[PDB]
Symmetry: D2
Subunit: 89 residues, 4 copies
């Protein structure tokens, strides 16, 4: 890669897919499908969520390190990154 | 069943509503930490649902072992479920 | 497998290995080795810890389900299992 | 450095002592939940150490970017570190 900001619309998309996938898990439960099948689908949803989170974080990181090079305020930018990682982890 | 199933459906509807909430936040260009705080809550909610489903599975396995034995088989089912839950 | 209880001594062993592995991470830090190398070693220690935890849990689960078949007290045994999972997760 | 390195060494010595504590508990046949409560604390401590090491790495990368640029390269180092940290 050379890093590209994920478009707002690209993120909204990924989130719509995650919504549809949760609605799918709900259908599975109503049909009394086996517990391991349901858990497999829940795991996939959680994986999808993590990848969205990770994309949002990458773009944030990019702004922080870019703003540091541009403007030189390393302390502020570190502290911004660390907040975002706190809430991500 | 009718009792417990509906509770899970409900939780899953709430999670769905919460993901819509995260979508709205993104469209409104709200700060990253606020969006991630909401994503963390969704992830927490998903974990608790996963945990409830595992509890019911484990309940069936142990209940069936008490009733009908085949303890080795049931134990091995429990361990396989834990393999995929972690 | 047919399930076998991990011996007390087998567990003490695995824990001694984890101790030695943490002491190894400490040496790496004193020698100012690169951060990704150090984190790779920390991950391995965490993995080793998880596998120990998992073994202790498997043996507990085995006692709970065995005691349920033997004695029939499903409620007590479920609640024992769930406590152990609470502190494991 | 001499300052920060020693703090990490210390944390790692405490983690080592804590794993000995878990070993003693097992030899004394203490209940499973008590042993797992102590293992959870060790795992927590290990996570915090991992997090401190990542913070220092990230600090070097951003600091070097402000001083000397090559922002794309540094960003890619940060993302690679996060790949392995999760």
């Amino acid at each position: 890669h050379v890093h590209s900001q994920e478009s707002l619309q690209k993120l909204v998309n990924r989130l719509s897919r995650i919504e549809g996938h949760i609605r799918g898990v709900k259908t599975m439960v109503q049909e009394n499908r086996p517990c391991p099948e349901v858990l497999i689908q829940v795991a996939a949803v959680r994986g999808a969520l993590d990848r969205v989170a990770r994309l949002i974080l990458d773009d944030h990181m990019n702004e922080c390190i870019t703003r540091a090079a541009a403007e030189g305020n390393i302390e502020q930018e570190l502290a911004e990154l660390k907040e975002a990682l706190d809430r991500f982890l």
